[PDB]
Amino acid sequence: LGSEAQRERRKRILDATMAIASKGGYEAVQMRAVADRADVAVGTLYRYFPSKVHLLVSALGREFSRIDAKTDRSAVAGATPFQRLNFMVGKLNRAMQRNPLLTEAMTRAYVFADASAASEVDQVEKLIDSMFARAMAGEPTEDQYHIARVISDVWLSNLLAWLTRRASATDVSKRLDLAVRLLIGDQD
Amino acid sequence: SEAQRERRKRILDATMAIASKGGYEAVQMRAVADRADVAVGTLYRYFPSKVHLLVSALGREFSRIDAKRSAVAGATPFQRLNFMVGKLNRAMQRNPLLTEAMTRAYVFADASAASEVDQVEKLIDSMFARAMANGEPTEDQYHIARVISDVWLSNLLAWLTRRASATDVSKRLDLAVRLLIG
Secondary structure (H helix, E strand, O other), X not given: OOOHHHHHHHHHHHHHHHHHHHHHHXXXXXXXXXXXXXXXXXXXXXXXXXXXXXXXHHHHHHHHHHHHHHOOHHHHOOOOHHHHHHHHHHHHHHHHHOOHHHHHHHHHHHHOOOHHXXXXXXXXXXXHHHHHHXXXXXXXXXXXXXXXXXXXXXXXXXXXXHHOOOOOHHHHHHHHHHHHHHHHOOOO | OHHHHHHHHHHHHHHHHHHHHHHHHHOOHHHHHHHHOOOHHHHHHHOOOHHHHHHHHHHHHHHHHHHOOHHHOOOOHHHHHHHHHHHHHHHHHOOHHHHHHHHHHHHOOOHHHHHXXXXXXXXXXXXXXXXXXXXXXXXXXXXHHHHHHHHHHHHHHHHHOXXXXXXXXXXHHHHHHHHHOO
């Protein structure tokens, strides 16, 4: 399904969405402005992404997909599940902390995305869960996927506290370390 | 004092009435003050912003749920915690617009409302921590409760947006509880 022309259009649309959110945050991300920056027809934009929530959640899914594909796992080749999980948690954290305004825009879209964006939210959730489950495992068990979901929930809550300046990066790291210990502490 | 407690009550009652009608967007400072029959200044003294107002309203909801144990003595820590989760789930599901208003304020509350957010988090964590204990909980139980509160918030957001059914939410919290305490 699809074409090289469609993949090229989608890449430009998401690049434009991220460029606009990096400069002016969630509020700056508007359909007309994104269409103009990506050099795509507004109608074509609406067809692939029916709203700014769809654009931002799709940009977030692409970002997690890139982190997953590009993270060098040789660094923890001889590490324990506890170390591998803390490594991936640390990698996702540093990636989100790099551009606060952009992270804030994608997170806002993700937290309040409606049912019409279920496929885009599921792609995000499955990617983060897969990264944590594979770190704890290789091919994970159903229990490792259930643990991964809990860690993702703790990660999201702490990301929200960090974005709003209610928690420091230090506070976030300590809270995530505690959750990992409570779930798999005996795996080190 | 008496008059102060009555003024805060009227302010929070007006907030809830407005939120129940039109959600987060309907809640505005002037409208709340007029409905509560308080001066805008009295409103700002206790609640510096609409975010402080909605997060404080959320704290009163949790406090009232907490106020309303003897019936669950015979049950195990696992069963008491699942019962507490069920009560909190049902309470938030009864009035979607009111829940949406309080959740939106809680999620995006800034550093200036940190005190109110911290108090709300302590209230929900204590409800879960107390459910797993007999008497005062241990630090380990409060840490477990914080993880349960994070799972609960994530599932509440999925439920509010029609991405998870009430059954889905129940099953996910059951799984998290099982993973943490057994």
